[PDB]
């Protein structure tokens, strides 16, 4: 009765125009998104006039922040609902995020994912066409404490930020290695330096059998381990709003932010796998999740979709006007550096960071078919983010060519063979999964 | 010389995006309605973008407030003229009801029944074609009472509000139960709590042989019974305008909201039917009405048809993402819930209020032609509004199938057959009423 | 150890300056006031600088404006802290209750029982001074429905208003009258017109053996009578934040306005009896109220006192400057009025309302002291307010001679001897109340 296509893609990391140049492939990248009813990507920089100011987020990379010209960019290439959950939506703080909501609905471009209070952030948003509809969710796992959204109170108003979906990891040590922690905290005499939050709490706070020291969790186990565990109220209000969109849309997309890896790099962190089965247990159509900067693996669960990462569609950070003072304090110059020659000096000439590496310049947009809520198709359509190219080439996507996309395709393949997943190849590159239904 | 066309509908509840789907019917719906000279709907919604404080309608059902962009849906469906006395507009309060007259103007569509003051709110709206011009008077016998504009006076301003059509109920009573309420009265001790307002006034405000008790109006009668009566001022100033309009248009239409029902739910109060007549007596040529969710009668009096309800065009009241927290408290939950979640606690998870029933998804939208203030045709096309559908597609309209169009058409031709009025049946489903002319 | 003095008025209805004239006795009363730590009085006016919308209040006299000045009248008189819930406060509807707020905050008056949401208007205010600090409370049981404020949603805003404590009414009739009153609803007709009613919420709202008719509440008895009772939200709610003042104040008022009569005029209402022993249940130290524009009897309950009603501190209603189109409108007139040409016709020329009765123009200050939270001391002041005088000059207060204070002095003992109150009298007319401790 109704058949929906939804495009999904990774981080848009824009900061110039002519996102879509005049190469064939780029232009049959924008016609491929323009046809689908819903084209989804996650607004990785902060669209801005001028309203904000920039915060430390030195462990994100630096600021990114752009003209909010970009957004023009974003939607004649096609795409018409953005997540804006992420490490960098905040770069200018509240007033930044603020104005990002503003000229996002000023320019009638659907978003989720941040919001003037902890609410308005985990709401779904509802992009209405005439075939039917999408609701999306936005939410991540990585970003600065403090940066999530928070509720009024009767007495105070909320606070703008992000959908947050936070975790806590524990270190599972043995009983020898847990007995040389104390005694290291008692020697060095840190044990001593808690002893007036013992007389004002009335209990010492290392003591939780747990323990929690170095601002770690540590547990006492058969050997040693590493644990990892969504946030249950995150869990529980997130999977609340994905039961409620199901009810008001025909599609429900959860869009998840997290670099956080697991036992290699490629991996997911266990409370990401957690978070994608819980999303689908309560309704969701798809799970499309981003943040390493490179491709991980797509899992089929209970018919239904998870990418753990689609990488970045968009690449330009060494790109960005807007570097801040204390960016630029990471570099130690001789002399006051522009932007470009700052990134140029940060990333030691070329010879690390992204640049160096393919994984950070291949990309993947799935093209997902939905007839009454079941899966029917699921395309893979591999993009090429230009490596090798000159840096003010480089991250602009395109379709890519067919030895490429099979050489992406490969690698999904590769990535995905942990959850049981097949692809059926075409002749040229790109590709499907294989589906039960 | 000159001819006009004007389509009509009642209330247009929309919350949602993607009003015309792309079900062929859908779209020749719109067709039909962009066809028309005028097409004339009855705006039972707030558009907002954030002004004016919601007010505690719970008798109304709650309140109906929408994103501002539904009046883009509402135009891009093809209507052109809208009427906005109705007990929804003032969901917002005074403050609202100047966002949504603010709106209205900026987006250039016509609209009357509220203003800044009574005068304002009593007004036609004229609206001038190419062909012809209509004149548009909108008024509500069904809202809070205060919620009716107020003009100015030499030392305050007015009140913003709605055009008002006040009506007073009279019980009348054997003259045996007339004197056990007035026993009743004075031996439950009501009376001796009146005594010092006889004081003040100087004489019991409950004996006027009529008596007021109970905020009742009671008259001792033959029988038994029950009258309704349009207040005075009301109906003698509308009826002032409609002249005026008359001067000043091709064609003058009033549509009145009104909730009201008569000896049985599917008749009109005795009321509406009065001032149905005095409109046309004063040179209206069409009276629409609406309020009750559900058809009602068509009434041909002097040649000028008479539409005491065409139900909704739009409903989608159970998909609006702004419930206030006095809505939210008519539902008593063990933890806060999301709108979706109170809509379907509201109405028992679908098992009372209007999803049970057909004749709340039925609508009907007539389309007549007049030839210089003569009418000279009045098709009528039946409207679908998707009985048994999820909750989030029930409510939007198409012109309904051969096989639904038939039993509407049959609904409407049994609602008007007490006022002499005969129905013309195409092959479609469609028709038309039988003229005099 | 701590020694505080609180000073307490009725009804502030003032419109006009010069409010302490150059009487001596006028004069000893800003003296009398000036020499607290705290005198309490209820705002009965809106102050007002244009902001807002007058409301049709005709059921409360009509509108009650003044020029925001008027509020420097007040402060320089003596009053230093002001109640606000009451039956005018929402004169100029949400816009103006915000506009006061605006004005007193700005001339550095602590306020309380109004706000720009529910749990504002709740909220006690702190006023501190170098002895102590009082805590004031502020709620009203005479408005127009929809008046009191509102809380916000996750969705939606509050409503600016007024501290609400809502009550019920309960006619008890005999089984025989009772069984007249359904003939009177199944035979007049009004039955059959809930029939949609009982379909669209499942079952007949009239049938509760309690009923619902006519907008009333009846129950069958063994005899007939009359009962109210609070609502039970609003005597929680107030009692719940009445704990909370307790311990963050010396002393704590609870300033309570009801114009509801009991069996006689003079008596209060049985629910504010109740909310009264309640409140000092909780820990209030004084329960004072204030409506009726008449004086009640006082209650020494628990060693605090209730005084039920203060009547007028000012009252200058026929002054006011500001009279609205609707409020000139009671009044059938051959030629466009003035204000004072208004008030003139509204009171028959003099020969009715509150001129001709000497009850509206006495009143009362007491003045309490308290030692850690004991009361050691309650004066009695009266108030007179000019009865006869011509328009322009009765309403402003000064201290009663001896003669006509020992008349007021005996009212009040008079009042409050079914509450077994006992008053000591000193030989210029003032007295004291006689305590226990
Ligand atoms: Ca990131
Ligand atoms: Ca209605
Ligand atoms: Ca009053």
Not at 21 to 39: C, H, I, M, Q, V
Not at 83 to 101: K, P, R, S
Not at 115 to 135: E, F, I, M, N, Q
Request: include cysteine; aromatic fraction near 6%; charge should be negative.
């Amino acid at each position: 009765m109704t058949r929906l296509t939804v495009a999904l893609s990774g981080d848009c990391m824009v900061t110039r125009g002519g996102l879509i140049t005049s190469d064939p492939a780029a232009e049959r990248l924008r016609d491929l998104l323009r046809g689908t009813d819903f084209a989804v990507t996650n607004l990785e920089v902060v669209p801005s006039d001028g309203r904000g100011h920039p915060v430390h987020n030195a462990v994100g990379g630096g600021c990114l922040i752009a003209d909010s010209a970009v957004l023009d960019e974003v939607t004649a290439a096609g795409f018409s609902v953005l997540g804006c959950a992420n490490n960098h939506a905040m770069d200018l703080g509240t007033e930044g995020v603020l104005g990002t909501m503003d000229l996002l609905r000023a320019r009638g471009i659907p978003y989720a994912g941040i919001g003037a209070d902890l609410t308005g952030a985990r709401r779904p948003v509802y992009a209405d066409r005439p075939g039917g509809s999408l609701a999306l969710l936005s939410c991540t796992a990585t970003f600065l404490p403090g940066q999530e959204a928070a509720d009024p109170s009767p007495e105070l108003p909320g606070r703008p930020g992000l959908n947050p979906l936070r975790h806590t990891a524990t270190m599972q040590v043995t009983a020898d290695q847990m007995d040389v922690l104390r005694t290291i905290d008692a020697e060095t005499g840190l044990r001593a330096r808690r002893a007036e939050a013992r007389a004002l709490l009335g209990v010492d706070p290392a003591l939780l059998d747990r323990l929690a020291l170095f601002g770690t969790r540590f547990r006492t186990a058969d050997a040693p381990g590493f644990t990892t565990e969504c946030d249950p109220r995150d869990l529980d209000e997130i999977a609340r709003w994905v039961g409620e969109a199901r009810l008001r849309a025909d599609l429900v997309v959860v869009s998840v932010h997290s670099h956080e890896p697991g036992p290699t790099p490629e991996t997911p962190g266990e409370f990401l796998r957690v978070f994608a089965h819980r999303m689908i247990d309560e309704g969701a159509h798809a799970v499309v999740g981003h943040g390493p900067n490179f491709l991980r693996g797509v899992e089929l669960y209970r018919n239904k979709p998870i990418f753990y990462s689609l990488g970045n569609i968009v690449s330009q950070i060494e790109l960005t006007d807007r570097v801040s003072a204390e960016d630029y304090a990471k570099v130690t110059a001789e002399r006051p550096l522009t932007p470009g020659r700052y990134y140029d000096r940060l990333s030691g000439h070329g010879t690390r960071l992204f640049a160096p590496h393919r994984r950070y310049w291949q990309s993947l947009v799935p093209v997902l078919t939905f007839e009454d809520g079941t899966l029917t198709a699921a395309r893979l359509h591999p993009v090429d983010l230009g490596f090798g190219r000159p840096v003010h080439r480089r991250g602009r996507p395109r379709l890519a060519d067919r030895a490429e996309a099979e050489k992406t395709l490969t690698d999904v393949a590769q990535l995905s063979q942990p959850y049981g997943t097949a692809i059926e190849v075409m002749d040229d590159g790109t590709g499907e999964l294989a589906l039960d239904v």
